[model samples]
Target: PLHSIISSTESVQGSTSKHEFQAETKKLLDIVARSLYSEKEVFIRELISNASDALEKLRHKLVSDGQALPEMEIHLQTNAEKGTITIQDTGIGMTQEELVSNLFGVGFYSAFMVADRVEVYSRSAAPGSLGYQWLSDGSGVFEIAEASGVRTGTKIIIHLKSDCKEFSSEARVRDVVTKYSNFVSFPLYLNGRRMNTLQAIWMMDPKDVREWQHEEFYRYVAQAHDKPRYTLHYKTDAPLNIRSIFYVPDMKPSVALYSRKVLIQTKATDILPKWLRFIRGVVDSEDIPLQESALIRKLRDVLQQRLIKFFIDQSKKDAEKYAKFFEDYGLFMREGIVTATEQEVKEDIAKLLRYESSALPSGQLTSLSEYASRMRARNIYYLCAPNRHLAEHSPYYEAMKKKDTEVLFCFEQFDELTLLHLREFDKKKLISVET
Candidate 1:
């Protein structure tokens, strides 16, 4: 196998092949260029995803069965001199055959949306296979032939169309890398500055990531030193693809209110979920694919659902930690369920909800699961109010106490509405004394 290296300048060194894609695929490419895909900038995401895949391939090599692998990084460079934006990765590069199959075989004509000309230079990390360069203008014909001194991985140089010259700006190119490639599994250096420094701990093996990683990421994203009380890292491949790491902080708005802008460190509008405004960490998955337009929102929803489910699962399996989760982060779940459309899921989310129940001796949090677990088969009682004092003074709790029934007391601002929305649990009626 050959070694990977960076170009001293923007130069090609190798031998390559040229081939045409099948006619039907060419037709599909024409459709993609004109009508199917929405964003012109999607090519950037595609490139980032491809780069991530390449890096992941190499990482897997090192961990699986003990293979020696060198450290590498993905670097992006914008060349005003060449009027090109290039993404380079120190990965297991491609050979002449792979180049012909990858570049010219079709479907990626999306590059034509921004590139007046696209050039690919690659060398296989394989011995005896010469490196090569491939060039295309999205026209029917392209050129490929011998070149010299290409690196092991691939370099895609996009000659931005005159109309798309904005891509050549260092800042604009950096924005592209920041958006789609932020979760890339390797070091992503955009113009020599590392961009993906905050790793997505959710995607790693649960045992591998330290609590420090979680807290550090939480502080980075939440912008507060408020300790994370509980973290859920889970992966699911069922109804949806889910890789999530969610933190419920011990800090509160009384101490620190999270700023989404601070989380992203931007001056622009964000499509991130306002409901998860308190969240401070990354969630990622290639399996839960999306159109570039709804990428952020869609991913957040997937994350939110998984988090709610994780809390519910934890609350079921380990009631004590679930109780502590409520002590720290239950309010978000309560508010989220009130607005959630799925009633069953809302009820499931409600099971993890906790409040200072008068039924509880004092100063202890009680979950619906805890309350329900001890209640009779048909006896499900709850009390909701704006605050604990109001719940204690309410006629509803007075009536429950008169009947010797222990009712859960939820006093958070949103708890009343959330309980009404839930209305039932385990076939037992959920009623608020205030209602």
Candidate 2:
């Protein structure tokens, strides 16, 4: 088609048709080229996105019919002498309807921003389907005709429009593809070399996976080198379609944010509030259009609410281990206790609290729930002092001993203030002697 459509008078074999674009040609092309993207390099990213979409469509079809999947891939080639960059994908090319159905028809126009002529070859993977060529210019009518030897999937040939020869180099093209789609699940190649090697496990369904992949994905996306202290895979299909996998490091930070498995941002500070920012993870949601800010805020709520619920459920387990965990990370629980605005939430965090009571040994930790169940009086008693030995001698605990009541001795710097914030646990008032 390149040869025949080179000048519009040349002839080729098989059926042929010329169709006018629905919109004004050059104007639409200029608008898409100059205005649609913030930058020109994104055109390649858009083309890459289109390729990934088709490949995804093909992958879906294979699964629906239970067919053996082929070598699923995308290929890229550049010929500097020809001033052309070609991208091909082993994806659903087009059916006769889908061919002219103008799939990615608008996105294909993005190529015009960098090049003068846009050439496309497609052969739908459907049985016995023949290949066809579609060619157009920023000028007007697009040409199409059946051709031979084209394989299943689509190929786009972009001829760099002279002034912007910057995109013609393999290095430049590879950089653009990488800067945007580096984590795309499909194998992406640039000029015969694979570009996207790191697969997005967060984009994958949760357990066609194993611990090994979790380690690999954690170090890569969570950006941590050490083994994760805890890995949480969170997925939901209701109210909002979000699948975010977060990591608590062998130490602590940000959840990488992604949409459609392509990296959107790294810190993802907007998606999570201050307290939740301590973990390292990836948040990928299908429903987020990002808007850049209602969708983001509400989408964040769904993740936060679920994780908060996750905490109460997890704290239901018991003591020797709880004591050790509280010793290790109790300060954070106190942070939540003091930080939570609502008493209900503060009580929720309180379930994870560990304190030593006069009922237990001075150094042995006990919890509010335990104290509440064993409590002799209505209020759950606690005394915050610099240390338990002194707390026992203080005016507060001496009164408790006179009354023969148990009082928890708060040893940590934050204890009294945090319990003050919680104020209660499971309906028993958290009574502090100093307060």
Candidate 3:
């Protein structure tokens, strides 16, 4: 259809149509903007996250191009007089069309949760692309124009609403940046001062991340004044692309701190098995398979033949450290062997299990392999008890003590439960000996 409503020389192409929000989207957006977030300052976290994503993309681009990448940083600058907070990033910028689509898009509406007016300045990396400025309010209207001297990145200026004027304070911006963006891959600068100085070392090579460096990282994540007792640098390609550092802090979990366990932050992801909950530190994996509802995800499964291989490799390299790991959190390891549905992997995990033998001294613990080495092909015996002292005094240990047979002692609450499920190892029935 050709409609020439304008004058003779000018026939307008009047195809411009307005977009309306979906019914559900409008309802959800209202709830989120007014009620979901505890504080309106969360808009700062959202903007910082966008900047981090941009930097991540830029870093990946640099890696792909095999070019020397400059240090990318996020800067937060605020103006009290103007009541504005500006977020700046040295990352790959957007074009005019991109600015319109991205700034006015659905997912990014959170920026309007606090802003009275929002502005974006982007200098695209593409050749002959002029910079542009995009401005908007939550009223579903926006303005765009040519801009220059934006550097090679993006900048966002948010004009705070009257109630949201606290965002213009430098201290407020700093606090917000530290809370959420402290661990971002790139540096964060507030008022032109570098803030996120600590590197996310879990992404680096294990050998390159030194002991002191790990201790420093643990200090930040664990929020502890003490050092780590054991650090497990686990990196794997199979079983869901895992790279994490599980630290066993010098302190143990306690009922005093609401169940006596040190807090674990950072890698609180699906990289570790459920029974491995005692582990502390970061778990970063790019390939974790999410559930359909996106509620939970699966990172590792025991059925994989590579499970045994990976466990063996980890055990061999960290045998001595695992000895310390068992001393500190051995209960979780035993729990893993028992509850795990993977039979073959459980056998392998069982080998890593350590317990005190009746024949051994009170303080010492021995592995199943050690007990099997001295066995006479008879039934392997064990006893579930509270601790080494009680296990040595058990009626079950009395008979094994008489025959000088080694009886492994399983402690911790789950010891009995795990052993009950596992039942036996290496085709030998593991029974609780009675007097």
Candidate 4:
């Protein structure tokens, strides 16, 4: 049949067709290039994420179908003199058909944000699939024809616009890769030097990972030599499918925030309630949707609540160890209780709090739940004094003692403020003696 396309080693040709882009092309391109991203640096992140997806798709296919695919890696080459940057991936390359859609596709068109013109040369891994080249100039129109060279993967050549020349710098490109794609699952090579060499240990199985690995991982992400004091490896299926590794650094903690192995924010703020900022490490979740920052706020609140509950649950198992932790960072928890607007979150934070009581030894601490259990009356009594001796001898505790009431002694600087904020816990009024 003369209508069918043909492929040969020496000579190549295909029946070409022209398709016009639908709708207002200029308006759409403007929104995609300028409006969607807050920074032009995100162009690199988007490209790398797409490359990782392609490699993962190929890997999954090989698992079930047993195809001998090329090695999975993303290679980057920057030529400052040529004013061009090339991103090549040895993944499942697209056929002539996919080239038409993906090149002009929503994700691929993002190249136009920084680059005036873009060239893509791709050879499909599928048997007998013809190689194709697609070129576009930020307009709705594009050109496609037979292409040769690089037989197993896709290569993207970005011609940087005059104003976008910053991307042409090798150092600039390196920084972008390191910042956003540092922990990308697959190997990433920049100018033949292996970048993103660090494995995303948070996504790996905790049982198989070693302690020394965690030490190295903590050091690498933290960029410090100090070993982590505590390491918490957590994953869950329901509520939100979360994979996370939380480390209590010997020093103050600063952790990276990630969504599906892609770095969202470094030393992320408001991701966890400020109280949990001391716990550093990575959190990778598939449940997180890529949207505006508004949605991220909601997700953070959800994660914060779950994390507070986790700490409370852990506290019950080893009260002594957690008591030490509370001693070091109790002010943060108290601050959370004082500032939190939701009753539910305030109560959850209270569950992790430890306080001294006249009923217990001087150094020993008790939880609100435990104090509630031993209550002789409806109100949970508390008294704030400068010292334990002062609190025991205070007028407030003197009257409560005759009634056989167990009063919690609050000598910490912020205890009264926290009690005022919390007001009640688990349906019991947190009554201060002065009130």
Candidate 5:
């Protein structure tokens, strides 16, 4: 009735009985430490998972109810001289008194294999509750005494036993956390340095993140120094549980592939459509196949069409942004249009095209399909010129100016080949108004 589980011995704060774990648990600890587990470093993993869960419960307090909680953290401190690893969490801080009780809350028992004594200090955030201390030696019993000034979460000090003193090293704990618990949702600091500053942002719901967080994740995934011009957050629980975010920034940009937030491979060459190799980002899915990544090639076509829509929408929203983007990146689109060989893909990339027209103002540009929508149709005549001055005064442009048909201007040499591949748009003959 005092605090929950029945223990062998207990006493009040400051001066207490030499409280021992129940006799049945002493035998249980031996098996748990020796035979039942093989992951010696797993003690760190389990402890981290426990701390992360505790932090998560505190978050649920903010979300599920009206309780506004303060910031929480899980920090680890290791001492080589003392051969001890200290882990602490600022989480919802109360526990049923069976941590060392017979498989009662045996999740904390894994450390017994590595520590001669596992000392725990925990306090509850609940009203009127006092801090308590626990210390256990896996060979037999533990002492539970009332403590003062203890923080609101659990703090575990694992006193490394003889051979297992490696756990007291920061390098070893860094490897363990990065391997097993790097994606933990809370800020996890190891030796006063935050170990988990980045989450698997791909795993979170798309709407939950702000633009700044996306910029942060984009910088990380792309290892980029500059900002992402466009961020594509694709989180679909359906259609293969595909969770992906792509940044359309530069062209030879290989999109890294992640499976459940772990790097399955680098520069995943073909997970996206070949044309989209120009884009840089992360593509993550649930089911992964090992052989040659043949199936993700299946995703290429859908993404090819999908990405074109993003550009078309961009063009719709901001001509200034889209025009500046096309000022340099326009060639990749043309290059893809020239090589893709499929009429549909050629048309898809063509929708991304922008060219200044005679019908519009000198600097105003329009898409071919959109232009056709403007004039109802023509043999889509364009001038591939270095500058608008020469093309506007060219003889053929004079001829087009005499007629009602508008002349489309293409400033780059590459545009000729891109247009050459199509030879037609909306069934109108492709004609060069320059040269």
Candidate 6:
């Protein structure tokens, strides 16, 4: 009976004063519908993020107290004939009071970016609550009343506008979901087909994560078959709540940037230093606040400073594995040193650098710190050459050898430029044998 009355009065628009919305509805609608997001597809991401937050809140409550919980997952359906996209979630369904506050909050309003008409049907998980329907048009007017045929969850149906008609297609909806929500914590299904196949490995504990898990995730993120050569599982909370899993795939450069489990960009150029482009994986942080362009620059400088310290510690922990990583990616470390403008950062990155030393056997790499430990004098010697054979026979090596000075062999293309930038390490001035 209530559903019939509500459906019959659908033509009647609620008064602006009775149901509070933007005072200047048209102006706010225009901004939220077009200007707020960079891409139209982001509306799906926003909705999914909101659903996840609701689920997380319920999860926290269930943990704190013994509360009955609903099945935890998100289901999506797209209909081209009706020009509608439906997103349903078994999470914390909003009550009448919460509908006015949470569902009508800025996050829920983002649906106006793509939908002309949005309808939310929800039955609260709490035992005493009843089902209700909340309807809104982009004009900022909304109506709320009792609803039937709703379960203990929330279902949102978006009537896509003419310009956003693509969202109604199952294929288009799947593409957007795969791109942005692939790493969401819960299972996501579209038209009875599960979408997010890969788990968010970065969020898992480092000790529990196995090699097979790394390989599977590396392939999923990198979109390649070659197994990862090195994996870095890092988390820190001092500077920011940073949780990241980086993989050095046996391929070209790649990296995925994420903020709060939502994918920001692939081949993300701003989070890690440009030299670290060889890394492949995801970086998730709550502190990032998600300004795609600005966050990259701000997080990059801070991450580089902190990351170099971690690499230095890792190198000390596993010399042989790091030697292999350095052999494949040593050029990146050198570039990091060369490009660093800060003396302290350069020195920290310098500790991670490994090179073939004249004092050590061929193919054996030594760190700058290790080199400094063996030095009898303050001058750290180095020779730039195409190979070890060339370096051993070079006139500079022959001269430096007589003094029993150990010379670090720089065989890469930019080795000279890197050393020139480093200048000194551990209070010892780096001197080129050629000079």
Highest TM-score: give the candidate number: 4
Worst 10 residues of 4 by lDDT: 1-10
Q: Where does candidate 1 stray beyond 4 Å?
A: 1-19, 31-39, 55-71, 103-109, 187-196, 254-278, 290-306, 309-343, 355-360, 381-404, 407-423, 430-435
User: What's the residue-level lDDT of 201 in candidate 2?
Assistant: 76
Estimate the TM-score for candidate 3: 0.68
Minimal lDDT window, size 10, model 6: 1-10
> For model 1, how does the per-residue alpha-carbon lDDT over 270-361 read when each residue is reduced to its tens digit?
32344556655544444432223455565555655666666677766776776765665656676767767777757755766666666776
- Model 3 residue runs over 4 Å out of place are 1-40, 53-72, 101-108, 236-241, 251-277, 285-297, 300-325, 331-352, 356-365, 369-378, 383-427
lDDT of 4 at 419: 80
Query: Weakest 10 consecutive residues, lDDT, candidate 2?
Result: 1-10
Report the lDDT of model 2 for residue 259.
72
Instruction: State the displacement of the C-alpha of residue 195, model 6, in Å, after optimal TM-score superposition.
Output: 2.3
How far is 347's C-alpha from truth in model 6 (Å)?
2.9
Instruction: For candidate 2, report its TM-score.
Output: 0.80
- Model 5 lDDT tens row, 1-435: 111111113234575436565577667778778766656787777787678778877778767778777768888888899898988888777643543332514657878878888878877656577777787777676777787767777788889999998988889989887765666778787876776656777777778878888888777767777778887777665456577888866432378776655455567877875556668877877666423655665667656766888889988899988898887677678778877766877887889898888778888889988777766534777878778888888888889888787888877667777888787776677887654
Which residue pairs overlap in candidate 3's backbone? 253-260, 253-261, 254-259, 254-260, 254-261, 255-260, 267-282, 267-283
TM-score of each: 0.73, 0.80, 0.68, 0.88, 0.59, 0.85
Superposition error at 237 for model 1 (Å): 3.1
lDDT of 2 by residue, 321-415 (tens): 44554666666777867887877767765776777888787567766777777866487878777777788779877777687678888876677
Tens digits of per-residue lDDT for model 6, 1-435 = 111101111222333223657677657767877777777788888789877877787778787788766578887888899998888877778897777665325656778888888888877777788777887787757778776667666788899999989999988988899888888887777887877877888888899999999999888888889998677888877877788888778764467777778887776767788788877788888775434576556678777766676677777788787777777787788877878887887888788878889999997788888888898847888888898898888888889897788889987767777888788887888888776
Two-way lDDT contest, 1 vs 6, winner? 6
Expressed as tens digits, the lDDT of each residue in 209-254 for candidate 4 is 8999899988887777899877878777776667888777776426
Q: Where is model 6 more than 4 Å wrong at Cα?
A: 1-18, 22-30, 67-69, 251-253, 289-291, 358-363, 384-414
Cα error, candidate 2, residue 328 (Å): 5.0
| Candidate 3 weakest ten by summed lDDT | 254-263
Cα error, residue 367 of model 4, in Å, equals 0.3
Output the lDDT of residue 213, model 3. 94
lDDT, candidate 4, residue 301? 73
* Cα lDDT for residue 258, candidate 6: 79
Regions more than 4 Å wrong, model 5: 1-181, 186-194, 250-253
